Design a protein around this motif. Structure first.
Motif, PDB file in Angstrom:
ATOM      1  N   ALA B  13      44.260  42.028  46.336  1.00 30.24           N
ATOM      2  CA  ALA B  13      44.696  41.893  45.646  1.00 30.24           C
ATOM      3  C   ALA B  13      43.876  42.055  44.449  1.00 30.24           C
ATOM      4  O   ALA B  13      43.592  41.032  43.933  1.00 30.24           O
ATOM      5  CB  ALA B  13      46.023  41.242  45.944  1.00 30.24           C
ATOM      6  N   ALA B  14      44.479  43.205  43.337  1.00 33.17           N
ATOM      7  CA  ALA B  14      43.650  42.957  42.044  1.00 33.17           C
ATOM      8  C   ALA B  14      45.291  42.590  40.945  1.00 33.17           C
ATOM      9  O   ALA B  14      46.359  43.124  41.227  1.00 33.17           O
ATOM     10  CB  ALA B  14      43.268  44.021  41.371  1.00 33.17           C
ATOM     11  N   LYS B  15      45.212  41.418  39.913  1.00 33.16           N
ATOM     12  CA  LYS B  15      45.848  42.166  38.634  1.00 33.16           C
ATOM     13  C   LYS B  15      46.220  43.152  37.763  1.00 33.16           C
ATOM     14  O   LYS B  15      44.655  43.612  37.513  1.00 33.16           O
ATOM     15  CB  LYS B  15      45.879  40.757  38.200  1.00 33.16           C
ATOM     16  CG  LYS B  15      46.861  40.469  37.104  1.00 33.16           C
ATOM     17  CD  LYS B  15      45.660  39.116  35.697  1.00 33.16           C
ATOM     18  CE  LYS B  15      46.558  39.147  34.417  1.00 33.16           C
ATOM     19  NZ  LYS B  15      48.048  38.157  34.927  1.00 33.16           N
ATOM     20  N   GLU B  16      47.408  42.975  37.103  1.00 34.80           N
ATOM     21  CA  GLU B  16      47.577  44.499  36.362  1.00 34.80           C
ATOM     22  C   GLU B  16      47.427  43.515  35.074  1.00 34.80           C
ATOM     23  O   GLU B  16      48.088  42.810  34.665  1.00 34.80           O
ATOM     24  CB  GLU B  16      49.110  44.960  36.758  1.00 34.80           C
ATOM     25  CG  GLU B  16      49.525  46.000  36.045  1.00 34.80           C
ATOM     26  CD  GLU B  16      50.573  46.265  35.835  1.00 34.80           C
ATOM     27  OE1 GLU B  16      50.638  47.371  35.839  1.00 34.80           O
ATOM     28  OE2 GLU B  16      51.271  45.108  35.790  1.00 34.80           O
ATOM     29  N   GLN B  17      46.476  44.450  34.438  1.00 32.60           N
ATOM     30  CA  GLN B  17      46.147  44.433  32.857  1.00 32.60           C
ATOM     31  C   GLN B  17      47.412  44.596  32.136  1.00 32.60           C
ATOM     32  O   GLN B  17      47.315  42.582  31.298  1.00 32.60           O
ATOM     33  CB  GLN B  17      44.854  45.094  32.507  1.00 32.60           C
ATOM     34  CG  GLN B  17      43.727  45.103  32.746  1.00 32.60           C
ATOM     35  CD  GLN B  17      44.327  45.891  35.078  1.00 32.60           C
ATOM     36  OE1 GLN B  17      44.655  46.133  34.760  1.00 32.60           O
ATOM     37  NE2 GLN B  17      43.193  45.907  35.349  1.00 32.60           N
ATOM     38  N   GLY B  18      47.959  44.671  31.525  1.00 29.39           N
ATOM     39  CA  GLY B  18      48.702  44.277  30.118  1.00 29.39           C
ATOM     40  C   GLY B  18      50.013  43.776  31.339  1.00 29.39           C
ATOM     41  O   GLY B  18      50.876  44.358  30.918  1.00 29.39           O
ATOM     42  N   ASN B  19      49.957  42.611  31.767  1.00 24.69           N
ATOM     43  CA  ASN B  19      51.575  41.986  32.168  1.00 24.69           C
ATOM     44  C   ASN B  19      51.496  40.468  32.012  1.00 24.69           C
ATOM     45  O   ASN B  19      50.222  39.665  32.531  1.00 24.69           O
ATOM     46  CB  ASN B  19      51.757  42.453  33.542  1.00 24.69           C
ATOM     47  CG  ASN B  19      53.196  42.171  33.751  1.00 24.69           C
ATOM     48  OD1 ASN B  19      53.339  41.604  33.393  1.00 24.69           O
ATOM     49  ND2 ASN B  19      53.262  43.573  35.134  1.00 24.69           N
ATOM     50  N   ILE B  29      33.518  40.631  41.648  1.00 19.75           N
ATOM     51  CA  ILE B  29      33.934  41.533  42.973  1.00 19.75           C
ATOM     52  C   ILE B  29      32.866  40.627  43.889  1.00 19.75           C
ATOM     53  O   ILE B  29      33.222  41.162  45.412  1.00 19.75           O
ATOM     54  CB  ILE B  29      32.975  42.908  42.484  1.00 19.75           C
ATOM     55  CG1 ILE B  29      33.811  43.423  41.367  1.00 19.75           C
ATOM     56  CG2 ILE B  29      32.135  43.379  43.442  1.00 19.75           C
ATOM     57  CD1 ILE B  29      33.362  44.681  40.717  1.00 19.75           C
ATOM     58  N   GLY B  30      32.070  40.223  43.732  1.00 19.29           N
ATOM     59  CA  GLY B  30      31.544  39.157  45.111  1.00 19.29           C
ATOM     60  C   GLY B  30      32.213  38.223  46.246  1.00 19.29           C
ATOM     61  O   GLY B  30      31.476  38.432  47.064  1.00 19.29           O
ATOM     62  N   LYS B  86      35.253  41.807  37.856  1.00 23.83           N
ATOM     63  CA  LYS B  86      36.363  41.663  37.947  1.00 23.83           C
ATOM     64  C   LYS B  86      37.569  42.509  38.113  1.00 23.83           C
ATOM     65  O   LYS B  86      38.688  42.172  38.720  1.00 23.83           O
ATOM     66  CB  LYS B  86      37.195  40.889  36.530  1.00 23.83           C
ATOM     67  CG  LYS B  86      35.799  38.990  36.559  1.00 23.83           C
ATOM     68  CD  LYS B  86      36.501  38.190  37.009  1.00 23.83           C
ATOM     69  CE  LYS B  86      35.866  36.960  36.277  1.00 23.83           C
ATOM     70  NZ  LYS B  86      37.060  35.423  37.391  1.00 23.83           N
ATOM     71  N   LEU B  87      37.072  42.889  38.841  1.00 24.38           N
ATOM     72  CA  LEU B  87      37.895  43.688  39.536  1.00 24.38           C
ATOM     73  C   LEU B  87      39.708  44.015  39.888  1.00 24.38           C
ATOM     74  O   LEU B  87      40.410  43.512  40.197  1.00 24.38           O
ATOM     75  CB  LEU B  87      38.032  42.762  41.730  1.00 24.38           C
ATOM     76  CG  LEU B  87      38.431  43.413  42.631  1.00 24.38           C
ATOM     77  CD1 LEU B  87      37.058  44.160  43.117  1.00 24.38           C
ATOM     78  CD2 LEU B  87      38.600  42.576  43.478  1.00 24.38           C
ATOM     79  N   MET B  91      39.712  49.767  41.968  1.00 25.41           N
ATOM     80  CA  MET B  91      38.816  49.958  42.024  1.00 25.41           C
ATOM     81  C   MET B  91      37.861  50.944  43.746  1.00 25.41           C
ATOM     82  O   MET B  91      38.953  50.716  43.990  1.00 25.41           O
ATOM     83  CB  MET B  91      37.681  49.078  42.039  1.00 25.41           C
ATOM     84  CG  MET B  91      37.717  48.363  40.559  1.00 25.41           C
ATOM     85  SD  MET B  91      35.998  47.058  40.481  1.00 25.41           S
ATOM     86  CE  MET B  91      36.420  46.961  38.760  1.00 25.41           C
ATOM     87  N   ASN B  92      37.372  51.246  43.522  1.00 22.71           N
ATOM     88  CA  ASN B  92      36.748  51.900  44.757  1.00 22.71           C
ATOM     89  C   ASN B  92      35.618  51.938  45.367  1.00 22.71           C
ATOM     90  O   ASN B  92      34.697  52.873  46.006  1.00 22.71           O
ATOM     91  CB  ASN B  92      37.223  54.313  44.518  1.00 22.71           C
ATOM     92  CG  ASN B  92      38.753  54.404  44.620  1.00 22.71           C
ATOM     93  OD1 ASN B  92      39.557  53.418  44.520  1.00 22.71           O
ATOM     94  ND2 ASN B  92      38.454  55.828  45.285  1.00 22.71           N
TER      95      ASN B  92
END
Ligand SMILES: [Ca+2]
Lengths: 46, 102
Positions: B13-19, B29-30, B86-87, B91-92
């Motif tokens: 799970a990654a955070k949404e930016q404009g929020n 990523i590590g 920072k994921l 990302m793929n």
């Protein structure tokens, strides 16, 4: 107390004037947190 | 993660930016590669079962968008490692483990 006619957890005076959501609670729109990213919504109070 | 004989696919799970109201915690990523595969941490490097999966010991593949994000964030970063981006939610990352390694 604030009036909620349509029973959807947003007061009547917020839906007609402007509000946003902070911590999953509807707060009145103060214009100064448009640069924190917060958007201002309006909707039908009925 | 493609070790060569078997593949392991994960979503982290990654955070949404404009929020402002998206409180999903931030990880690199590590740290995400460590969590998603339960890899062991030997001192400074990251090991799968018995394979080294650290940034140097494997070949990383991305699509165009992930590579562009990682590059433009490596510019604004010192101690430039890909495992420090920072994921960013979409990302793929494809880790490929080599056949032979020294
Ligand atoms: Ca209402």
């Amino acid at each position: 107390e604030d009036l909620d006619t349509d029973n959807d957890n947003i007061p009547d005076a917020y839906e007609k004037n402007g509000y946003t959501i902070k911590d999953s609670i509807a707060v009145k729109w103060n214009d100064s947190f448009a640069e924190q990213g917060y958007k201002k919504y309006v909707s039908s109070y009925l | 993660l493609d070790t060569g004989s078997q593949t392991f696919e994960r979503r982290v799970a990654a955070k949404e930016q404009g929020n402002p109201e998206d409180k999903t915690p931030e990880i690199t990523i590590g740290e995400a590669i460590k969590k998603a595969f339960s890899a062991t941490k030997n001192g400074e490097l990251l090991y799968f079962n018995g394979i080294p999966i650290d940034e140097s010991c494997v070949e990383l593949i991305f699509d165009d968008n992930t590579s562009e994000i990682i590059k433009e964030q490596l510019k604004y970063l010192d101690d430039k490692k890909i495992y420090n981006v920072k994921l960013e939610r979409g990302m793929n990352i494809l880790i490929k483990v080599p056949s032979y390694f020294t």
